[PDB]
């Protein structure tokens, strides 16, 4: 059978994977202690896609936690699902990263890559045949970008035939906390575009606005945001574990989403988000879901593709649907905005329908998008990087770490190439 081993990278991914993993075990109905409460036959069957079974009715999550700071891990371990997480999967370093990419890429990573490779391979023979891997981390995270760029490089030569899914969050476009963050992201993306085959792009600012739009709760927690992205990431994973006529393999999907190799950055899309009163002012119908599915405000990833155009669109529908209601609506949206697609490809929509609704809600869906709205993203960081590199601010550290200006020169040159290629194909 074909399975997935997951990676918790960066200190955000510590919050990400923790929420993500409970979001899985819960809806399969396992108690926090780990003794599965046998209730659903299908989830009892397709639990093996992500978990192995230990003794005592306990499915071990096949994931790895990596970090450097014990306190974050101790909080995760002391959480409601630390007991379902494994001490051997807890691998860590004796150093404080300083939120330094180079230290996490050259200095601290050197003595930790060996152990994690030993750890990850031990699970590799434990399973038979993977589809690949997925990595929850941040492009703007210091230790995560330092670790992740190292690992994605190494996992590539060992298993160049698998799926290297990457799950990263983009920092706040307005205001980035880490001042050396543009340096970290620019270094990371240089290897990312060379190593990754897929990239999930998520931004916090849009998540906050969604609260202003539909949550309206004023004061949520960051964990609530993790709950949202885990739900979205759960939705794309429903395909593999769930039955029903929809083709689940990411490779059935990747060839359908990737026209050319340089296209790796993709944007999420989710289905009904509802405020207080509209919970009973909403008549759940495939159009009104579809209308809400394609709303500029229900966008959450980076920015409005209203600035640009649409390359490819793919939506997975979770619940008791049929082929028709999705059929005419695609014709409806086709005719609604036919010009805002690209004339390069007609029928650029690839639809899948999951007949198994989530636990409690019936009419749901997820959307993955590749539009011409990423130009704003890396052009933004282009002025930033050029501005700080114009007078090489915050540089004596990395030269002391052993880095040189040359490495950045091609790294921005690679990024500028992606600026043109996205522009050339569409414009």
């Amino acid at each position: 059978m074909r399975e997935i081993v997951h990676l918790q990278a960066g200190q955000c991914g510590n919050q990400i994977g923790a929420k993500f993993w409970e979001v899985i075990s819960d809806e399969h109905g396992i108690d926090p202690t780990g003794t599965y409460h046998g209730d659903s036959d299908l989830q009892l069957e397709r639990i093996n896609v992500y978990y192995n079974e230990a003794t005592g009715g306990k499915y071990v999550p096949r994931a790895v936690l990596v970090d450097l700071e014990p306190g974050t891990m101790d909080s995760v371990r002391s959480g409601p699902f630390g007991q379902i997480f494994r001490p051997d999967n807890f691998v860590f370093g004796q150093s404080g990263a300083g939120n330094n990419w180079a230290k996490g890429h050259y200095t601290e990573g050197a003595e930790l890559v060996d152990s994690v490779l030993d750890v990850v391979r031990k699970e590799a023979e434990s399973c038979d045949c993977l589809q690949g891997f997925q990595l929850t981390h941040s492009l703007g995270g210091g230790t995560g970008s330092g670790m992740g760029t190292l690992l994605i490089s190494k996992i590539r030569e060992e298993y160049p035939d698998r799926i290297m899914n990457t799950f990263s969050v983009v920092p706040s476009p307005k205001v980035s906390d880490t001042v050396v963050e543009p340096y970290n992201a620019t270094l990371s993306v240089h290897q990312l575009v060379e190593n990754t085959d897929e990239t999930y792009c998520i931004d916090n600012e849009a998540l906050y606005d969604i609260c202003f739009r539909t949550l309206k709760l004023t004061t949520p927690t960051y964990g609530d945001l993790n709950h949202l992205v885990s739900a979205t990431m759960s939705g794309v994973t429903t395909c593999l574990r769930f039955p029903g006529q929809l083709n689940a393999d990411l490779r059935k999907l990747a060839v359908n989403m990737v026209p050319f190799p340089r296209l790796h950055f993709f944007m999420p899309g989710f289905a009904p988000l509802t405020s207080r009163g509209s919970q009973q002012y909403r008549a759940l119908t495939v159009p009104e879901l579809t209308q809400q599915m394609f709303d500029a405000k229900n966008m959450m990833a980076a920015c409005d593709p209203r600035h640009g155009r649409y390359l490819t669109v793919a939506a997975v529908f979770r619940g008791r649907m049929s082929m028709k209601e999705v059929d005419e609506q695609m014709l409806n949206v086709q005719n609604k905005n036919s010009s805002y697609f690209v004339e390069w490809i007609p029928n650029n929509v690839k639809t899948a329908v999951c007949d198994i609704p989530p636990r409690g809600l019936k009419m749901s869906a997820t959307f993955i998008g590749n539009s011409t709205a990423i130009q704003e993203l890396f052009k933004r960081i282009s002025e930033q990087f050029t501005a700080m590199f114009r007078r090489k601010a915050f540089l004596h550290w990395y030269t002391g770490e052993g880095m040189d200006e040359m490495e950045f020169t091609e790294a921005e040159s690679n990024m500028n190439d992606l600026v043109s290629e996205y522009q050339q194909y569409q414009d």
Binding site: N247, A248, N256
Partner: protein
């Protein structure tokens, strides 16, 4: 004697095999256990089932079909379904990796190590059968798995068995609707590989099937099941000549000989006239007159072809039910006198009648009509080339900007085979107006 083996390739072709076999078990009264009640029909496996099932001395009906698929999901529920005990475990040929909509991956990467098992399946079926008129291959041009895998086997069954018929049924890709954009890639590859080996290819489109549902069946929200019964009823009718008798009996060999005029082009159209809702048949009446008008009406066909835009060559009507040649030959004589219907002057007669006295019957929990008089309409016309004319302008642009090529060339293939198809379809289309031009 009179028997065949059916082939269902790909998760696309699996449920239709279920539905038809589910349909097929009803008219024979096949209980879900696998045996009849105390009444006597069992023996050396020789009765109405012997053409379709193998109810051997053990007394269990064994369907003469092999279900081949590469994605274990869908086959795993059906082997946990209702009739799973009737299905032979490893005739449900399952696979562990998908073709990922890639025709070459389904033809090269994985098809090698499983076909020999499948070749082992067919020979075990070949030895037990007696006459084996041919095969019933159910597939799809836009096959995420059906496309690539069926191509290899249909080559291999041809080289070892080139003296029997091979009947091909496939859903034709929607003309303006595309659930995949690699679909133009594999479908054009399927055609050029099959035209020189496939005997008789029959196609259909779902959108027109849907249109019928809310035109006359009055269903604005059907499902697969309704569609599967319709095409399941279609194949049931063509197999009724084998199961029943009639005033005259016609076999697929007679169809093939009489249908295809010239080599290469072997692509007629299928139609069923008495498609109607229950209430309409209730307070209205069915007779040979109106159903013949219905069966020739330009909007009752399931393929996006305008008959007055083309010209007719082949006409085959299979009357299953209580009909008499008196009104039959009179009615079709009026059809010959009809001026809108433009047959080619090449064929003075192009009309193949098949009479069967058994009325088609309702299915439990079904949506079909209450049929005493029915026709299975097999016809071929020149109005079809526009489908491939639709295909080529779709293909030429996407080939010119070489979409998705890094994928296919990444797994060890090149453009020369793709170049082969474009002139082949060019060769195919140019024959179509050449046979069109009198």
């Amino acid at each position: 004697m009179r028997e065949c083996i059916s082939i269902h390739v790909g998760q696309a072709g699996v449920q239709i095999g279920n539905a038809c076999w589910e349909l097929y078990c009803l008219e024979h009264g096949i209980q879900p256990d696998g045996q009849m009640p105390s009444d006597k029909t069992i023996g050396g496996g020789d009765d109405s089932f012997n053409t379709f099932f193998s109810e051997t001395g053990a007394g269990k009906h064994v369907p003469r079909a092999v279900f081949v698929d590469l994605e274990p999901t869908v086959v795993d529920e059906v082997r946990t379904g209702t009739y799973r005990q009737l299905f032979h475990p490893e005739q449900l040929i399952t696979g562990k990796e998908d073709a990922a909509n890639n025709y070459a991956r389904g033809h090269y990467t994985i098809g090698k190590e499983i076909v020999d098992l499948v070749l082992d399946r067919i020979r075990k079926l070949a030895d037990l059968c007696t006459g084996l008129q041919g095969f019933l291959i159910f597939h799809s041009f836009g096959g995420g798995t059906g496309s690539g895998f069926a191509s290899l086997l249909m080559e291999r069954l041809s080289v070892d068995y080139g003296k029997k018929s091979k009947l091909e049924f496939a859903i034709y890709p929607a003309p303006q609707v595309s659930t995949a954009v690699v679909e133009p890639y594999n479908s054009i590859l399927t055609t050029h590989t099959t035209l020189e080996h496939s005997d008789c290819a029959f196609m259909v489109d779902n959108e027109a099937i849907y249109d019928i549902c809310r035109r006359n069946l009055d269903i604005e929200r059907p499902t697969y099941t309704n569609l599967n019964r319709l095409i399941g009823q279609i194949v049931s009718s063509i197999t009724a000549s084998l199961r029943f008798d009639g005033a005259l009996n016609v076999d697929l060999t007679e169809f093939q000989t009489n249908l295809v005029p010239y080599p290469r082009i072997h692509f007629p159209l299928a139609t069923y006239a008495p498609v109607i809702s229950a209430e309409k048949a209730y307070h209205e009446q069915l007779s040979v007159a109106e159903i013949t008008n219905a069966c020739f009406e330009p909007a009752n066909q399931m393929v996006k072809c305008d008959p007055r835009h083309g010209k007719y060559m082949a006409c085959c009507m299979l009357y299953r039910g209580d009909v008499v040649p008196k009104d039959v030959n009179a009615a079709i004589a009026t059809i010959k006198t009809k001026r809108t219907i433009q047959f080619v002057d090449w064929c003075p007669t192009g009309f193949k009648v098949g009479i069967n006295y058994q009325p088609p019957t309702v299915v439990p929990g079904g949506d079909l009509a209450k049929v005493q008089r029915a026709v299975c309409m097999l016809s071929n016309t020149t109005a079809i080339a526009e489908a491939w004319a639709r295909l080529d302008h779709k293909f030429d642009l996407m080939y010119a900007k070489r979409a998705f090529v890094h994928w296919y060339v990444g797994e060890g293939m090149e453009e020369g085979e793709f170049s082969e198809a474009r002139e082949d379809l060019a060769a195919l289309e140019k024959d179509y107006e050449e046979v069109g031009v009198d």
